[PDB]
Amino acid sequence: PTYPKYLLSPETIEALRKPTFDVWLWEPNEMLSCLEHMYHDLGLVRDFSINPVTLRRWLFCVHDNYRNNPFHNFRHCFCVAQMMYSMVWLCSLQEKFSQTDILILMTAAICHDLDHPGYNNTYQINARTELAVRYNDISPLENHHCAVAFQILAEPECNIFSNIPPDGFKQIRQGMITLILATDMARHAEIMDSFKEKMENFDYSNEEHMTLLKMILIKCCDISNEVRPMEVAEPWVDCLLEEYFMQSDREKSEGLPVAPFMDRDKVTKATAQIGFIKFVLIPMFETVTKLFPMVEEIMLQPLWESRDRYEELKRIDDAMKELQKK
Ligand SMILES: CC(C)Cn1c(=O)n(C)c(=O)c2nc[nH]c21
Ligand SMILES: [Mg+2]
Ligand SMILES: [Zn+2]
User: Fold this and answer.
1) Which keywords belong to this entry?
2) Alpha carbon 192 to chain centroid distance?
């Protein structure tokens, strides 16, 4: 008949495989069903004997541990996971990666921003927060996201790894930790350099090579909003700036340094994305494209289009402010 929302329709399940998926259409419950379907569809439930009910309880617990920040929230984690899911199909990753690696990629993507406070590492460090003190200024947020991820998995009713032998667990844990920590943008240049260094003669059978490729994959997915259709990507920019301005505001009231790229007075939607697309997104997907050429047309294309559109927006934004400032 006319089924309920949480029962995904065959059209949605089909659409869920492409980077064009409208992530804004669904409520959390529907997004949880989407994540659940990903695990079954990728054959992870099957190959890792994941209790299908535990899979649901786990996702629900994961959701409960994401905060309602304007950007680093559950919907962001759904975006990262859904783009990873898309890349698996787009790049035929199951031909290159083992099911354990797929499991690592997906679980890390879902768990990568757990219990994010809404203020980055620079804020944690400068304000000497409890997190910065706990982690000695070393990627405190990522270390925390990772720790929460395993405290959750430590709860029996949420342990989707309960049927994986201990050696498998250790391997997965290590892999997840590496990937989540790799999402700290402060290490972006470092990670990109190491990847390109191995990209000179890439070897899919080289464990070090694959680890770096997985780090790049989760990084690509994490900052992949702009790869999505303009109408889906744009509203994310306002969410990010909302979070950024909240921090710079607070940093001014407490006397802590402020990052220009978070300055309510020097940043616009356009200036924020132009540079990020040109010097972070495009270069990275460009190197990834060497390994998977199909990535150019499906993701580099929209990035080029976004870059051009934001440059146009900037021109009129600049023109508009040339009528202001008495
Ligand atoms: C998280 C943030 C520091 C990096 N970051 C991001 O993840 N996305 C998606 C952007 O669009 C963006 N624009 C500037 N920085 C960005
Ligand atoms: Mg993060
Ligand atoms: Zn993230």
Assistant:
1) Cell membrane, Cell projection, cGMP, Cytoplasm, Endoplasmic reticulum, Golgi apparatus, Hydrolase, Magnesium, Membrane, Metal-binding, Phosphoprotein, Zinc
2) 16
State in Å: Cα 198 to ligand 2 middle.
Answer: 25
Instruction: Tell me how far apart the alpha carbons of residues 208 and 11 are, in angstroms, rounded to a whole number.
Output: 39
Contact present, 262 and 248 (Cβ < 8 Å): yes
Q: Tell me the C-alpha distance between 243 and 241, whole Å.
A: 5
CA distance 196 to 213: 10
Task: Give the closest ligand to the alpha carbon of residue 80.
Answer: 3
How was this structure determined? It was done by X-ray
> Nearest-5° angle of CA 16, CA 306, CA 89?
25
Helix (H) or strand (E) holding 4: none
CATH second-level architecture of 1-326?
Orthogonal Bundle (1.10)
User: What amino acid is encoded at 79 in this protein?
Assistant: C
R_g of the chain, CA atoms, integer Å: 20
Output the six-digit token pair for 301. Answer: 């294309």
From 72, 116, 144, 145, the catalytic residue: 72
Residue identified by tokens 């001014």 is 252
